Design a protein around this ligand. Structure first.
Ligand SMILES: CC(C)NC(=O)c1c[nH]c2ncc(-c3nn(C)c4cc(Cl)ccc34)nc12
Length: 267
């Protein structure tokens, strides 16, 4: 878990910043090879990075960014897998000819990572297009576990600046965060993906979003988004938590629609 500083080389350039700290490109001398890595660099801020590291340590899934380890040098450092193509929202903003089939493939991979997280009883709490990283145009990984929580063995929810536009009604009204609240967030992520990285609830403040939702109103279908995918978004935005689907059901819907588009592409 603890890494050797002399085996680690950092670039002086920055990539971007998450909930806590800033991320830089680096290189780690492995047993034989050299591994390109992304490195998160920074009293309270120290403990949140360690907690984040603690969370990532426990996670083992292809559609989640794996932690390589941690290192204490000039600052505390969180060394992670590199995803060269960067954040999904920025990628789609810059690559507008990405096909809907490709988008379906990527959001499905996110749903697989989240199915795993749910099965592991972790809540992400910041699930948005900005935190989906592209290893390739056809390979997405979930990142930024800065707000993530391991659920207590006796509880289905964690009780707490927030990304309000991604948060379910129960998060806003009761400060309660569950896998179902991650499902709500996943719906906004889908909307972002099919809108090619557009910001949700454009030009609205948190209070106006709340008023919209309590009127039963939801963001419209993005141009060119398949009706089946818009329907799934809306289902993720089920107001009542008990009637909102879990990731197991979400992933299956996505898996099935993807194969349907794949095999119809052969027709
Ligand atoms: C910061 C948080 C989410 N990022 C991470 O936790 C990352 C973990 N592995 C990564 N690999 C690449 C990038 C990245 N590549 N490029 C080109 C970026 C541009 C921006 Cl603006 C942000 C991150 C990246 N970010 C991460």
């Amino acid at each position: 878990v603890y890494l050797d500083r002399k085996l680690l080389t950092l670039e002086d350039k920055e990539l971007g910043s998450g909930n806590f700290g800033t991320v830089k490109k680096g290189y780690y001398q492995m047993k034989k090879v050299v591994k390109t890595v992304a490195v998160k660099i920074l009293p309270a801020l120290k403990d949140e990075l360690l907690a984040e590291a603690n969370v990532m340590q426990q996670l083992d899934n292809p559609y989640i960014v794996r932690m390589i380890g941690i290192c204490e040098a000039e600052s505390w450092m969180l060394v992670m897998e590199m995803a060269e193509l960067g954040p999904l929202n920025k990628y789609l903003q810059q690559n507008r000819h990405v096909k809907d089939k490709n988008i379906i493939e990527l959001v499905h991979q996110v749903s697989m990572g989240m199915k795993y997280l749910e099965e592991s009883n972790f809540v992400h709490r910041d699930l948005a297009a900005r935190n989906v990283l592209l290893v390739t145009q056809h390979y997405a990984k979930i990142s930024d576990f800065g707000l993530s929580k391991a659920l207590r063995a006796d509880e289905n929810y964690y009780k707490a600046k927030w990304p309000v536009k991604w948060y379910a009604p129960e998060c806003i009204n009761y400060y309660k965060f569950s896998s179902k609240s991650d499902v709500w967030s996943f719906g906004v992520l889908m909307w972002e993906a099919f809108s090619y990285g557009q910001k949700p609830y454009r030009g609205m403040k948190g209070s106006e979003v709340t008023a919209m939702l309590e009127k039963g109103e939801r963001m419209g279908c993005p141009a060119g988004c398949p009706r089946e995918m818009y329907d799934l978004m809306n289902l993720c935005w089920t107001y009542d938590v008990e009637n909102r689907p879990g990731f197991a059901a979400v992933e299956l819907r996505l898996r099935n629609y993807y194969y349907d588009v794949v095999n119809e592409g052969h027709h």
